[PDB]
A and B are shown apart, each in its own frame.
Chain A
Amino acid sequence: IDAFRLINANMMVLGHEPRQTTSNLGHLNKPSIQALIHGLNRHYYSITINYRKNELEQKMLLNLHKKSWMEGLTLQDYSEHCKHNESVVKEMLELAKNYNKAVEEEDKMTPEQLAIKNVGKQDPKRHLEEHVDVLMTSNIVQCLAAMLDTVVFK
């Protein structure tokens, strides 16, 4: 948000330093970087910015962005997921099964080579297990398959 305030040059005979409610200055020095901001603490002293929010506005922005990311009438996209679960999912299920064969026959080399090299030293090379993400996609498969009974019946 970043706001500023200009200082004069006539009042450098006098001081510049009453700074009431000291917390604001020590808060100003933390959001902060540079050599040139450090060179522009002269001619500039900032000022704290804060935020007050209408609970009406907060709650209707919550309406918008926790309700309107769900879509209209709210059944519509979940029944569309139910449309996915019998026509499109089996193709990415084939992709999942091919990944969970091909990645697996080389990630069974991994505890072998853990026993081989050392007790757990530095990163040897490229690949990893990465199975957890593919399993989470399979969890998406099962949850939207659970959606089928709920939506389709009644």
Chain B
Amino acid sequence: AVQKVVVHPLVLLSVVDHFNRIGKVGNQKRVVGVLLGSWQKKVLDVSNSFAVPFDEDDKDDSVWFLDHDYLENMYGMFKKVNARERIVGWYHTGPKLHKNDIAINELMKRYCPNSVLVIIDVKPKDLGLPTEAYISVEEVHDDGTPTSKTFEHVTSEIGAEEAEEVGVEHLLRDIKDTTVGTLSQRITNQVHGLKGLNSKLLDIRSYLEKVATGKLPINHQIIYQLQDVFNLLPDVSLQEFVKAFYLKTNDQMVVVYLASLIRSVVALHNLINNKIANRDAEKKEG
């Protein structure tokens, strides 16, 4: 299977400019394109991407178009310029996935054996991490469903490359509060609490919503399973979890005595140098 996918900034900007391509027709069009990459390992690599023609109307909303010939000749171009590069999958704009978002993979499984998708968001209202990626597997159920063919998410991030470092890290010039040390992580320390909160808000909204609508949706397998997983691991016990706190005292201990000893001595030594060069230049100046 896949360990995780590694998305580079170039493909995300190659989605943003694609939305700028089709932003003039406006009327009813999602962004859909084709993903390029490199199957490196169990981890996955992504280098390039490009467009595709695609449309979808209102009545009988299963009307969808993937030009094979565009794929053939333009993949011939990209293979002609780079032989290291080959196809790994596809992408679209992804507000979410709708019902028709299986047929694209079910077309191009005959190109990549595991045709992986990428769900992004061109509108950065997402205070989470963009570039979601699914992969389609089968999980055939105890109820005797014949074949449930469900996309499943494998985790994702934004990777690094030496030239794209030069690119991105020059294109920002905007914000740098880090001074990387005890405080490059505290902004993200607000982020981890707040972005557990957003996900939990989605959780409670979903839980309240399943009782009202979906007719009896409630997830029927993975509600009671993973809910009891939740209800099996909030350890708040008090027998030796209290007794981790002399190890907490030990955590305090080392840093207290390192700070208290060496910080004062170094600052004092600098005071020595400052006051020597202060008075010995004072007697020569005045």
Q: Is there any pair of Cβ atoms, one from A and one from B, under 8 angstroms apart in the complex?
A: yes
The CA-CA distance from A61 to B13 in the complex, in Å, is 9
Say whether B259 faces chain A, with CB atoms less than 8 Å apart. Answer: yes
The CA-CA distance from A120 to B272 in the complex, in Å, is 12
The CA-CA distance from A60 to B125 in the complex, in Å, is 9
Chain A residues in 8 Å Cβ range of B175: 62, 66
Check if A72 sits within 8 Å of B155, measured CB to CB.
yes
Q: Which of A56, A64, A131 is in CB contact (< 8 Å) with B262? A: A131
The CA-CA distance from A100 to B258 in the complex, in Å, is 8
Q: Which of B122, B171, B181, B188 is in CB contact (< 8 Å) with A78? A: B188
Chain B positions 184-236 with a Cβ under 8 Å from a chain A Cβ: 185-186, 188-189, 191-193, 195-196, 199
Closest to A93 in B: B254
Say whether A46 faces chain B, with CB atoms less than 8 Å apart. Answer: no
Say whether B247 faces chain A, with CB atoms less than 8 Å apart. Answer: yes
For this complex, 5 residue pairs linking A to B, each with C-beta atoms less than 8 Å apart, are A71-B129, A111-B272, A135-B263, A142-B255, A151-B192
Check if B251 sits within 8 Å of A72, measured CB to CB.
no
Chain A residues in 8 Å Cβ range of B188: 70, 74, 78
Given contact pairs A72-B156, A78-B189, A65 touches B168 in the complex (Cβ within 8 A): yes
Instruction: Known pairs A61-B13, A74-B191, A148-B248; list 6 more (Cβ under 8 Å).
Output: A61-B168, A62-B175, A72-B156, A73-B196, A78-B192, A136-B181
The total of chain B residues at the interface (CB under 8 A) is 51
The CA-CA distance from A66 to B175 in the complex, in Å, is 9
Q: Which of B127, B181, B244 is in CB contact (< 8 Å) with A139? A: B181
Check if B129 sits within 8 Å of A60, measured CB to CB.
no
Chain A residues in 8 Å Cβ range of B126: 63
Say whether B277 faces chain A, with CB atoms less than 8 Å apart. Answer: yes
Chain A residues in 8 Å Cβ range of B130: 60, 63-64, 68
Chain B residues in 8 Å Cβ range of A64: 9, 12, 130, 158
The CA-CA distance from A101 to B240 in the complex, in Å, is 33
Q: Mark B117-134, 1 if CB is under 8 A from A, else 0.
A: 000001110110111000
The total of chain A residues at the interface (CB under 8 A) is 53
The CA-CA distance from A46 to B255 in the complex, in Å, is 57
The CA-CA distance from A66 to B280 in the complex, in Å, is 48
**Top 3 nearest A-B pairs by Cβ distance?**
A60-B124, A145-B251, A142-B255
Q: Is the interface of A mostly helix, strand, loop or mixed?
A: helix
Closest to B132 in A: A72
Check if A141 sits within 8 Å of B272, measured CB to CB.
no
Q: Which of B9, B191, B247, B273 is in CB contact (< 8 Å) with A67? A: B191
Q: Which of A65, A70, A145 is in CB contact (< 8 Å) with B172? A: A65
Minimum distance in angstroms from B90 CB to a CB of chain A:
21
Chain A positions 10-65 with a Cβ under 8 Å from a chain B Cβ: 51, 53-54, 56-65
The CA-CA distance from A151 to B191 in the complex, in Å, is 12
Chain A residues in 8 Å Cβ range of B122: 56, 60
The CA-CA distance from A97 to B262 in the complex, in Å, is 12
Say whether A6 faces chain B, with CB atoms less than 8 Å apart. Answer: no
Chain A residues in 8 Å Cβ range of B40: none
Check if B269 sits within 8 Å of A111, measured CB to CB.
yes
Interface centre among B129, B191, B247, B248 (most CB of A within 10 A): B129
Check if B171 sits within 8 Å of A53, measured CB to CB.
yes
Say whether B174 faces chain A, with CB atoms less than 8 Å apart. Answer: yes
The CA-CA distance from A134 to B258 in the complex, in Å, is 9
Chain A residues in 8 Å Cβ range of B186: 143
Say whether B16 faces chain A, with CB atoms less than 8 Å apart. Answer: yes
The CA-CA distance from A93 to B150 in the complex, in Å, is 47
Closest to A69 in B: B158
Check if B258 sits within 8 Å of A138, measured CB to CB.
yes
Chain B residues in 8 Å Cβ range of A9: none
